[PDB]
């Protein structure tokens, strides 16, 4: 009997980016 | 019977961009 | 058959930072 | 008997956001 | 059976930085 | 005799985000 | 019968850089 | 033959941030 | 017959630079 | 006799925060 | 005779954070 | 038995940066 | 027949640093 | 002999960002 | 005959610094 | 005949930190 | 004996950035 | 005779801090 081999975890996602700041109100 | 191995996971999706600024 | 463990997929990126106010009129 | 392997650990959770600013 | 060592799970992210003062009136 | 295979460590967590700065006091 | 061994995922790309800010209009 | 899974190639980096306005004349 | 293993993927290309600023 | 494998190391601790600012 | 398998290095620690700046003196 | 080498644990994060002066009165 | 084992990709390089800003013209 | 694939070396870091203008006299 | 494995690649060199600023 | 197994590369070092800015001249 | 290749140690971190001028008197 | 494997490299040291600012 020879065992199976496990996998490793996936890398967590890069976050979103900053929304541009507001115009003249 | 001799065993079979597992498969690795994939990286998560990159986040959506933030909401744009306010007025006044 | 002692089969191999599945890995776990990466986690989604967080939201981007939200923009702040434009000019101080 | 022939041995069995170990399993890998998972990434830690992402921290909570900081507390928002003061007044005056 | 000389079994395989368990791994250790990742550590939780620290707090985010706390906001500072708004405008200087 | 065939040995078991060890796992690797989990990735440490992404930190929290900056709290927005204070309003008018 | 001896199984094949799977590969791991490729690292996601480093993002582009900030375009320099506009000249006199 | 239980052949090994192919990996997946990394994802392309996103665009760089776009420049903002130059001087306020 | 005894099996053959897989091959690993490659890192994605680094993004192009952002567009340069506006006038006025 | 057939050999036994090694074990992996762990991530180092996250540093302590910096000292807070001065006066005057 | 079948050899043992070596482990890999641990990831270096994330640094501490900036101490907030001084008050009125 | 040609046993497997131990790995080395990650190194501790350095100090955070120290705050600078508050207001210039 | 026993197969060969493939290697993994090298880590992409850390980018250069910002050139210091211009002197008096 | 089904020999093992070679890996690929990491890619060189890009240029550092170029400095902008000094003082506005 | 039984096969021989491959070797891993190395990290790429760190980029050169950017060009220093302008005058006027 | 059974082959030896190769190791992977070490992680590149974290850079030094910014020296504090000059005093009154 | 087709022995296993040695890995290569990580590269030292670069210098920290050097401080700029203090106050403009 | 059956072969023996290699060992992995270690992370490089973290750089020294930059030189502190000028006067005048």
Rounded-to-integer distance, Cα L8 and Cα L14, Å: 18
Determine contact, residues A9/B10, Cβ cutoff 8 Å.
Answer: no
Determine contact, residues H24/G25, Cβ cutoff 8 Å.
Answer: no
Q: List the one residue out of A3, J5, G3 whose CA is nearest residue D4.
A: A3
Q: List the one residue out of L17, E9, R5, E19 whose CA is nearest residue A9.
A: E9
Q: Cα distance from K11 to chain J (closest Cα, Å)?
A: 4
Rounded-to-integer distance, Cα H1 and Cα B6, Å: 16
Rounded-to-integer distance, Cα R22 and Cα G7, Å: 52
Residue of C nearest to D13 (CA): C11
Q: List the one residue out of H16, F19, G22 whose CA is nearest residue I17.
A: H16
Q: Cα distance from H24 to chain G (closest Cα, Å)?
A: 9
CA atoms within 13 A on the CB side of J22: 4
User: What one-character DSSP code corresponds to residue F1?
Assistant: -
Structure solved via: cryo-EM
Q: Cα distance from L25 to chain J (closest Cα, Å)?
A: 8
How many residues appear in chain P? 25
Nearest to F17 among D10, D13, D18 (CB): D18
3-state SS, one letter per residue, for chain J = CCCCCCCCCCCCCCCCCCCCCCCC
Determine contact, residues N12/M13, Cβ cutoff 8 Å.
Answer: yes
Resolution in A: 4.5
* Whether P19 and Q19 lie within 8 Å, measured CB to CB: yes
**CA angle, D9 then D12 then D17, to 5°:** 175
Cα–Cα separations (whole angstroms), residue J14 to E13, F12, G7, O21: 10, 10, 31, 36
Rounded-to-integer distance, Cα M3 and Cα I5, Å: 8
CA atoms within 13 A on the CB side of E7: 27
């Amino acid at each position: 009997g020879i065992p199976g081999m496990p996998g490793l975890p996936g890398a967590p996602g890069k976050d979103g980016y900053d929304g541009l700041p507001g115009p003249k109100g | 019977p001799p065993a079979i191995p597992g498969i690795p996971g994939i990286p998560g999706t990159p986040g959506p961009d933030g909401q744009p600024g306010t007025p006044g | 058959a002692p089969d191999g463990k599945k890995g776990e997929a990466g986690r989604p990126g967080r939201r981007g930072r939200p923009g702040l106010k434009g000019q101080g009129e």
